[PDB]
Amino acid sequence: KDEDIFILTVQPVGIFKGEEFFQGNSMLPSPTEPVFLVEDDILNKIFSNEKTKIFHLG
């Protein structure tokens, strides 16, 4: 009516319990919780997390 609204619809893909990424389903985050941009180091700790069995596809 007076302001502008920017809404984003997202799908949960994982949960970080401290420094460990547990893939699965989230636990319904409460409303008014802050949302932050993800850093590149966190993403590289998910896709590129292999031990002596890593194959760089691209």
* Residue 30 engages other proteins in binding (rule: CB under 8 A): yes
Name the amino acid, one letter, at 49. N
- Does residue 24 touch other proteins according to CB under 8 A? no
Residue 10 CA neighbour count, 13 Å, CB half: 10
Return d(Cα 14, Cα 49) in angstroms, integer: 15
* Chain-centroid distance, C-alpha 29: 13
Tell me the closest approach of the beta carbon of residue 14 to other proteins, in angstroms: 17
Number of residues that bind other proteins (CB under 8 A): 8
The answer to whether 33 contacts other proteins (rule: CB under 8 A) is: yes
Q: Is 31 in the site for other proteins (CB under 8 A)?
A: yes
